Structures are given as structure tokens and as C-alpha cells.
Design an enzyme around this catalytic site. Structure first.
Site, PDB file in Angstrom:
ATOM      1  CD  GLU A   4      18.430 -25.170  13.841  1.00  0.00           C
ATOM      2  OE1 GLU A   4      17.594 -26.274  14.021  1.00  0.00           O
ATOM      3  OE2 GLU A   4      18.028 -24.070  14.245  1.00  0.00           O
ATOM      4  CG  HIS A   7      16.663 -29.038   9.939  1.00  0.00           C
ATOM      5  ND1 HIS A   7      17.552 -29.788  10.679  1.00  0.00           N
ATOM      6  CD2 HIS A   7      16.225 -28.055  10.755  1.00  0.00           C
ATOM      7  CE1 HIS A   7      17.642 -29.283  11.893  1.00  0.00           C
ATOM      8  NE2 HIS A   7      16.846 -28.232  11.966  1.00  0.00           N
ATOM      9  CG  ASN A  42      18.388 -20.056  12.636  1.00  0.00           C
ATOM     10  OD1 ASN A  42      19.240 -20.207  11.793  1.00  0.00           O
ATOM     11  ND2 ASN A  42      17.876 -21.052  13.314  1.00  0.00           N
ATOM     12  CD  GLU A  47      11.758 -22.912  13.522  1.00  0.00           C
ATOM     13  OE1 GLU A  47      10.627 -23.151  14.027  1.00  0.00           O
ATOM     14  OE2 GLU A  47      12.657 -23.757  13.413  1.00  0.00           O
ATOM     15  CG  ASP A  92      19.524 -32.555  10.279  1.00  0.00           C
ATOM     16  OD1 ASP A  92      18.847 -32.027   9.375  1.00  0.00           O
ATOM     17  OD2 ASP A  92      19.102 -32.657  11.455  1.00  0.00           O
TER      18      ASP A  92
HETATM   19  C1  LIG Z   1      16.346 -26.147  14.706  1.00  0.00           C
HETATM   20  O1  LIG Z   1      15.593 -27.339  14.498  1.00  0.00           O
HETATM   21  C2  LIG Z   1      15.858 -28.285  15.562  1.00  0.00           C
HETATM   22  C3  LIG Z   1      15.109 -29.570  15.225  1.00  0.00           C
HETATM   23  O2  LIG Z   1      13.757 -29.513  15.663  1.00  0.00           O
HETATM   24  C4  LIG Z   1      15.455 -27.672  16.901  1.00  0.00           C
HETATM   25  O3  LIG Z   1      15.904 -28.504  17.965  1.00  0.00           O
HETATM   26  C5  LIG Z   1      15.015 -29.474  18.391  1.00  0.00           C
HETATM   27  O4  LIG Z   1      14.035 -28.724  19.111  1.00  0.00           O
HETATM   28  C6  LIG Z   1      13.069 -29.582  19.772  1.00  0.00           C
HETATM   29  C7  LIG Z   1      12.048 -28.656  20.463  1.00  0.00           C
HETATM   30  O5  LIG Z   1      12.656 -27.770  21.405  1.00  0.00           O
HETATM   31  C8  LIG Z   1      13.759 -30.536  20.746  1.00  0.00           C
HETATM   32  O6  LIG Z   1      12.808 -31.440  21.318  1.00  0.00           O
HETATM   33  C9  LIG Z   1      14.832 -31.334  20.022  1.00  0.00           C
HETATM   34  O7  LIG Z   1      15.532 -32.165  20.945  1.00  0.00           O
HETATM   35  C10 LIG Z   1      15.792 -30.389  19.315  1.00  0.00           C
HETATM   36  O8  LIG Z   1      16.753 -31.151  18.579  1.00  0.00           O
HETATM   37  C11 LIG Z   1      16.122 -26.281  17.049  1.00  0.00           C
HETATM   38  O9  LIG Z   1      15.753 -25.687  18.272  1.00  0.00           O
HETATM   39  C12 LIG Z   1      15.767 -25.373  15.878  1.00  0.00           C
HETATM   40  F1  LIG Z   1      15.551 -24.009  15.958  1.00  0.00           F
END
Ligand SMILES: *[C@H]1O[C@H](CO)[C@@H](O[C@@H]2O[C@H](CO)[C@@H](O)[C@H](O)[C@H]2O)[C@H](O)[C@H]1F
Length: 312
Positions: A233, A205, A169, A127, A235
Site C-alpha cells: 500500500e 505508507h 499484512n 494489522e 504512498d
Molecule cells: C492499508 O491502509 C489503507 C489506508 O488507510 C487502508 O485503506 C483505507 O481504509 C479506510 C478504512 O476502511 C478507507 O476509509 C479508505 O478509503 C482506504 O483508503 C487499507 O485498508 C489498509 F489495510
């Protein structure tokens, strides 16, 4: 095939999930985790806050639990994540200049060294870009260190782990746009100058009915730079409640994402962000939205399950 693991295995690809180690004590959760995936990544266990809760005090418990799970069940292990602006403990946020740079280099060095030979690929930086183009401005790394921090991370990670695939990423870089364009320029630059960088991850996402029509096209142009690409990631969320049409569209959306990957030779595979809707991170961030995963909250397979099977 009769499991997604088998379908991805035969396709020569990865199909992974985001593991919360604390869930392994729920039989249905473990049953699905054991049977349907061939890769595993820690949802939260390997980030900065869970690994270096205090300066120089590493806590590898949760991380090791995930690494053990993978080795015990024969799954590939993906690392997430070394440098990331969110979930950064306050002690780090309070550091400045060279000091901050040393904390970063040390975190990258220790965490990479500890998992050396266990983690096959790492999201070294996650990010780093801003929607709209350019660098993310609300990042402590960008603010305190300027533009060169990314290159420093990759060089430091490669020195601690000679063989792990090193990836950058991001999200909203799925289609050709200003964010993926800046991403593309950075990868091109790194490859031209020999900065160690091996792969590019696309979070994916997505929103139901909104899958970028130029997904394949975009994955392919990154691949042509001589890097591997991966969906990291995945979904595809919706406004809840879900219904027969929303589930049908989501199925078709899952199919499209997986075929984009199947059509780019260097696309390593796809990792979904969880197993079941009941533990999905979506409702906590986007109130009113959800039902984004392949299994519903009762552990029943949604139509998406069969779509992915077909795409493989
Ligand atoms: C990809 O995006 C996901 C969704 O936010 C990230 O994972 C989440 O990260 C948060 C913050 O650390 C946690 O609270 C969630 O449980 C987790 O699903 C992921 O790290 C990212 F790069």
C-alpha cells in the site's frame, strides 16, 4: 518500456493499484488504470463492512465489480482483506466468544469461497501487531479470541480456497524494529508448525525523506523463511504544498522502495495505494499532508513516475 506496466512486466513483477470502482467512469482515471498496472486490489470493496454489512447477509456487488475489471483487462487480482480490526461492523463488535469466532470463520469462508479462482492472493489478517512490539491491543479479534485467532483465520481461508496465496499484512514493519521482529517470530512459528501462510505484505505508507535504510535487509530475512513478500500500500506522503525539492526527494524515495523489491528474488512486486493525489486517503487522516501518489490531482505524472520506471 513506455508504461510502468511494461517495465514491471519485463522485470517479472507486479505493479498494482488500489481501485475505487466508482472512478472507472472518469476517462482519465480509467485510461491510467488500463495502461499502467498489471495488478489490481480493491481499496474498499472487499473489506468486512462492504461484504457482510449485516450478519450473514453478503453484498458482493462492489467486490464483483473489481473482480470483473481485473478479468476484463487481464490484470492479476489481490484480495483485501478478510480479518481486520478497523471497518468492522457493529454487529460483529457486539458478538462474543465462540459466537464471535463462528462469525469470523463464516466471513472468511464465504468471502474466500465467493472469489475462489479469481483472487490470486489474500491479506487474510491485516494489522495484527502493535507498534512497539507484541499484539495489537485495540483489536476486537485479539480481545475476544486471544492469540490463536490468526492461525484460525489462515486455516479457515486455506480450507475455503486451496490455491490462493495466503498473506499477513502490516505497516511500520518495513525496517528492522520491534514490530517487524514480532511479525518475523510469528511467520517463523507458522512455517515451523505448518500453519498455511505463503506471503508477507509490507504496507509502506512512508513519509518523504524517511525510507528505512534496512528495507532490503528486512525483506530478505522474511524471504529466507520461505515466504514471498510484497509491498502492498505504497504512498510516500509530504507536507503540502509540494515543491520541486519535495517532489525530487519523493522520486528518489520511490526508486529506493522499488529497488529493495527488485533485489529480493521473492519480492512479488509493488502496489501503490491509488492512482492520483486527488482521491488519496492521506489528507483525511493526516491533515496537512498529501501529494503521496505517482500522479498529481490533474493527472500529470510527478517525477516519481520516472523513478519507478528506472527501478524496474
Ligand atoms: C492499508 O491502509 C489503507 C489506508 O488507510 C487502508 O485503506 C483505507 O481504509 C479506510 C478504512 O476502511 C478507507 O476509509 C479508505 O478509503 C482506504 O483508503 C487499507 O485498508 C489498509 F489495510
Amino acid at each position: 518500456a513506455t508504461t510502468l506496466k511494461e517495465a514491471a512486466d519485463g522485470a517479472g513483477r507486479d505493479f498494482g493499484f488500489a481501485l475505487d470502482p466508482n472512478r472507472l467512469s472518469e476517462a482519465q482515471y480509467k485510461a491510467i488504470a488500463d495502461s499502467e498496472f498489471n495488478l489490481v486490489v480493491a481499496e474498499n470493496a472487499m473489506k468486512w463492512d462492504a461484504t457482510e454489512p449485516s450478519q450473514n447477509s453478503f453484498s458482493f456487488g462492489a467486490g464483483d465489480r473489481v473482480a470483473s475489471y481485473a478479468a476484463d483487462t487481464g490484470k492479476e487480482l489481490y484480495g483485501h482483506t478478510l480479518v481486520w480490526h478497523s471497518q468492522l461492523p457493529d454487529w460483529a463488535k457486539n458478538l462474543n466468544g465462540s459466537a464471535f469466532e463462528s462469525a469470523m470463520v463464516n466471513h472468511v469462508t464465504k468471502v474466500a469461497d465467493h472469489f475462489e479462482g479469481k483472487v490470486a492472493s489474500w491479506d487474510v489478517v491485516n494489522e495484527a501487531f502493535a507498534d512497539g512490539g507484541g499484539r495489537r491491543q485495540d483489536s476486537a479479534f485479539q480481545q475476544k479470541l486471544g492469540n490463536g485467532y490468526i492461525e484460525t483465520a489462515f486455516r479457515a481461508a486455506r480450507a475455503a480456497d486451496p490455491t490462493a496465496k495466503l498473506c499477513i499484512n502490516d505497516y511500520n514493519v518495513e525496517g528492522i524494529n520491534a514490530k517487524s521482529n514480532s511479525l518475523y517470530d510469528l511467520v517463523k512459528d507458522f512455517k515451523a508448525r505448518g500453519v498455511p501462510l505463503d506471503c508477507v505484505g509490507f504496507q509502506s505508507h512512508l513519509i518523504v525523506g524517511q525510507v528505512p535504510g534496512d528495507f532490503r535487509q528486512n525483506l530478505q530475512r522474511f524471504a529466507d523463511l520461505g515466504v514471498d513478500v510484497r509491498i502492498t500500500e505504497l504512498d510516500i506522503r509530504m507536507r503540502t504544498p509540494s515543491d520541486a525539492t519535495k517532489l525530487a526527494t519523493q522520486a528518489a524515495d520511490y526508486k529506493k522502495v522499488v529497488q529493495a523489491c527488485m533485489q529480493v528474488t521473492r519480492c512479488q512486486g509493488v502496489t501503490v495505494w491509488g492512482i492520483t493525489d486527488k482521491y488519496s486517503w492521506v489528507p483525511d487522516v493526516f491533515p496537512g499532508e498529501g501529494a503521496a501518489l505517482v500522479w498529481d490531482a490533474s493527472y500529470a505524472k510527478k517525477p516519481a513516475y520516472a523513478a519507478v520506471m528506472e527501478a524496474f
